[PDB]
Amino acid sequence: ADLISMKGDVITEHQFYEQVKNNPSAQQVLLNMTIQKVFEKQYGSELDDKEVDDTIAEEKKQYGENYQRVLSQAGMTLETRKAQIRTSKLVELAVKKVAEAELTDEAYKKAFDEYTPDVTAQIIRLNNEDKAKEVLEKAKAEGADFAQLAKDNSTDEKTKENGGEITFDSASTEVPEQVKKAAFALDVDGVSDVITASSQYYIVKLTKKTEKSSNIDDYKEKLKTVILTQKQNDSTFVQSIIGKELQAANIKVKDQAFQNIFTQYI
Amino acid sequence: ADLISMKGDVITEHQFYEQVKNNPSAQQVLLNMTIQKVFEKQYGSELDDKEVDDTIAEEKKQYGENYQRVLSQAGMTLETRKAQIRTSKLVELAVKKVAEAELTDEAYKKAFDEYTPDVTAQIIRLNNEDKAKEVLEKAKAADFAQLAKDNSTDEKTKENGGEITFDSASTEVPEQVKKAAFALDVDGVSDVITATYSSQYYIVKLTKKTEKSSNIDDYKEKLKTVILTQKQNDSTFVQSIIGKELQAANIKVKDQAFQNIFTQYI
Amino acid sequence: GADLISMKGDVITEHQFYEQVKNNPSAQQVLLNMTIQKVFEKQYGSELDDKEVDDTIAEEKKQYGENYQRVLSQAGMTLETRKAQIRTSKLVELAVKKVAEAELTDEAYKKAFDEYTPDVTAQIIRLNNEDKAKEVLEKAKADFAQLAKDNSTDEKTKENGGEITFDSASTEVPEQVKKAAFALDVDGVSDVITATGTQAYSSQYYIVKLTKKTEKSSNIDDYKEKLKTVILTQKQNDSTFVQSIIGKELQAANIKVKDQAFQNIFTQYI
Amino acid sequence: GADLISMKGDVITEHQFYEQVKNNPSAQQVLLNMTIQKVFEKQYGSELDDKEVDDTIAEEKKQYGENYQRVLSQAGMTLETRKAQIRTSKLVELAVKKVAEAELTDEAYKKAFDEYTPDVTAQIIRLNNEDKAKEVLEKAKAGADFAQLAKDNSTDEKTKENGGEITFDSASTEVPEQVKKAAFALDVDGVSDVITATSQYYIVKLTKKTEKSSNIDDYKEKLKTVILTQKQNDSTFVQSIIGKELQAANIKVKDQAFQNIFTQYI
Ligand SMILES: [Cl-]
Ligand SMILES: [Cl-]
Ligand SMILES: [Cl-]
Ligand SMILES: [Cl-]
Ligand SMILES: [Cl-]
Ligand SMILES: [Cl-]
């Protein structure tokens, strides 16, 4: 109950709460706790722990020895960050499930009209931007071998061996969004500009293009993936899903200090 | 008590405490609560309430009609800010005492040596260097008061012939103007002095100069103010006084989560 | 030792003048400053290039102009020993930056990261009169770039439609202007902000229009360098800190004060 | 020459210290004072007994008490140099007196005579508070005996025990100029209003007024002492005497650093 003690006085946990409740950073914590509980009740039994555990494991490799430090500077630990990813994946799972159910034929067609089928291309991934520009000037030379440039310079171990080559749709998650839209904009044998997506630098050469069908029926599972991704990144949709899940949980704010921050949702 | 309720669950105050205690902005609130209680205990009787009201009055004038908006951004009200300002003055007061107590004869000797008593002069300030050179050829040959009235940009001195009295400790006039002025003879005109958002140009005419007395007591309080004002703005000094006052209060941090924000002090 | 003054049937020698001048407070400071110079040259001298010292004294000569020679006399300096003083100052602040860097804790970085607010773009309109600021405020309830271009006293911002980018740590913008701007929403106009009438500056009045706001990241490393500089420049301007480093460095030299007259001026350090 | 400071692999010597310190304005003042001291000690020194200085030293030492060592330190000085300063001061005034005596003229005597007011006996009640002064002012004007009012109320310890009584002329420095001019304007046995000197508050009663004689010969020696004392307190006169005495010594400045500070005299 006592947080701090001194000569002739103490600070209690409740005294600490009564001061800190007006802090906007602390108000955000109660909002995020409420989003966690509501979404845990609704979709927590549907979300596997392996979905969270793989992502927190994935994130630990990206930072490595800096991971303990950066979390402590943000005021977090292994558990609190795990809860944050879990919360984020519960909202995403809810957006996925509500979107899936609302998939219309009129929706499938809109995606179908803007869809692109398999496109083979040679991609070179880079770290240094000075290298990326130096690789690009070589790629536009008279008899420039794009394959050897990929073999010599590219960081991507999987495509590096095969002269940077890769095949992908609009629905592929294995290549970035900015990289794909650059690839579809090119003519065949066209080399892209330096595409950017502690970030990564890409150059793409368009090799092949495949014909798209009239019949939508065979592209159903891939158009589904495009529409879901669009809904995952439509913030107006994501905020509605949060708002509607909170309204369905029937949250009552007991202390009036936290009344305004829930107004966006309630 | 409960803070949020929903279908078959509540977020309790203690659960909110357990999440929010790691929040860096929250950790600052407890530290400030601890500083507020200790400094009130020791220096509260000495501090008069009127100069706390002078600061919040000045602060209300600065922001004007942005004050409630700026206060809400910080997560505060007029009352809680007035408490925060009171704490600042209690720390300021304690810092002043320890600075007063650490005054040596050597610091006075040094401050006395570097001090130059009040001189009276006439200054012309200009934005353009080549206009300052044009005005200087007139000034060095002349009615200096009129030249200031017609050319000077300093709106404070301009109207009364560019007239000004200052000593070495003066913050009204720049270092280079002061030093240039002290080095002049009476009725002498300086060269263009350049003070360094935007650099300015100056022409100084010395009217009068006070003779610096032998005895140090003649400028005792003026030198005391120089030495204390310097210590008041040293963050390292202020943070050391806070630390020593917290150690004299015999603080025990009971919750491990706050241990780190206190190690700098205790 | 030589003779400094000669009269009929008597002289003042250099040793006799020394034996009197050693009690002069100003003279005791000169021995202290000669001591600081020698120690800081031995330690950090090799690191400092002479070009930067030549830049400072060249800048300084332009600032004073033909006043400079006259001004150096009053400071107890010739051109040579001023150039040496500037060098010593640079060697001190160089040494203070190293120890400040070496004493950086994670809590210092964390506290700075918490209090720091990232770059926001905005348009400002500085004004001399209060009644004119009330006039422009109601008009700016609008093309804020035009209202800046016509009315703004700040000639730096006026050219680019009043626009400016700044952190919380920017000293280019006043504290109350920054705090007012961070409290706005995007495309939001503040009421009149007032920099009050003090001795140095006359009272200024500001109207702020927030244009862009960076979202504050979760990763400290995105702002590490800006947070590093604000913590270091704080310690650089702390007189107590600089004095402690000087005192530490003088203690490391193992200085023996031979003449008793100077013992007290060294006691603050040793 | 000897070593002042030593450290690892280096020393600062006396000559090195001299070559630096000689450009310092305060150090240049010391040498000018040493030169004034040696010249005046050579010419006039035999006339001044050290008892004269020792009496003045014992006066200061008895005043400040056991803070005497500290107040000398605070003034950038010691017993030996302060003793030398008093000595040099007394030899200058002694030398100035001789020139003043020889330059006495009947014009000078006539001007002193016109401004002179002869001996006046008056009872002064020195008061620290203005409220307490106006109370005693009422009591004196009523019936009342003025000697007891001074005994039972005056702060000046010397006059208090003698019934506030003191005798003086226009020359006497032991009573203030505002009090003297008030006293000369009263009628015999008349009481003044409250007088402010600057802040102490005086009430005068004129006991005895000497009628001023028509003959200058009746005040010859007193008027002489006025003229000489006036020449003593005239800074321009004193400086000129020091200046001319330095010229007579045939002073060569053997170092160009000190050339300018002597040029103020020679
Ligand atoms: Cl093929
Ligand atoms: Cl504050
Ligand atoms: Cl002391
Ligand atoms: Cl020096
Ligand atoms: Cl707004
Ligand atoms: Cl005493």
UniProtKB/Swiss-Prot annotation, chain A:
> Which molecular function terms from Gene Ontology are attached?
peptidyl-prolyl cis-trans isomerase activity
**EC number(s) recorded for this UniProt protein:** 5.2.1.8
Specify whether Cell membrane is a keyword of the entry: yes
Q: Which GO terms describe its cellular component?
A: plasma membrane
Top EC class of this enzyme: isomerase
Function, as annotated, reads: Plays a major role in protein secretion by helping the post-translocational extracellular folding of several secreted proteins.
Q: Please report the name of this protein according to its UniProt entry.
A: Foldase protein PrsA
| Species per Swiss-Prot/TrEMBL record | Streptococcus pneumoniae (strain Hungary19A-6)
Q: What is the lineage of its organism?
A: Bacteria, Bacillati, Bacillota, Bacilli, Lactobacillales
From Swiss-Prot, chain D:
Swiss-Prot/TrEMBL GO biological process terms:
protein folding
Q: Does the keyword DNA-binding apply?
A: no
Which InterPro entries does this UniProt record tie to the protein?
A: Foldase_PrsA, PPIase_dom_sf, PPIase_PpiC, PrsA_foldase, Trigger_fact/SurA_dom_sf
Q: What is its EC number?
A: 5.2.1.8
A GO term from the CC aspect: plasma membrane
Which keywords does the record carry? Cell membrane, Isomerase, Lipoprotein, Membrane, Palmitate, Rotamase, Signal
Entry keyword annotation includes Cytoplasm:
no
Outline the extent of the PpiC domain.
117-208
Q: Name one Pfam family in it.
A: Rotamase
Reactions performed catalytically: [protein]-peptidylproline (omega=180) = [protein]-peptidylproline (omega=0)
Membrane topology term? Lipid-anchor
List cystine links.
none
Q: Which GO terms describe its molecular function?
A: peptidyl-prolyl cis-trans isomerase activity
Subcellular location as annotated: Cell membrane
What the protein does comes down to: Plays a major role in protein secretion by helping the post-translocational extracellular folding of several secreted proteins.
Query: Which HAMAP family does the entry mention?
Result: Foldase_PrsA
Similarity annotation: Belongs to the PrsA family.
* Name of the protein this chain belongs to: Foldase protein PrsA
Species per Swiss-Prot/TrEMBL record: Streptococcus pneumoniae (strain Hungary19A-6)
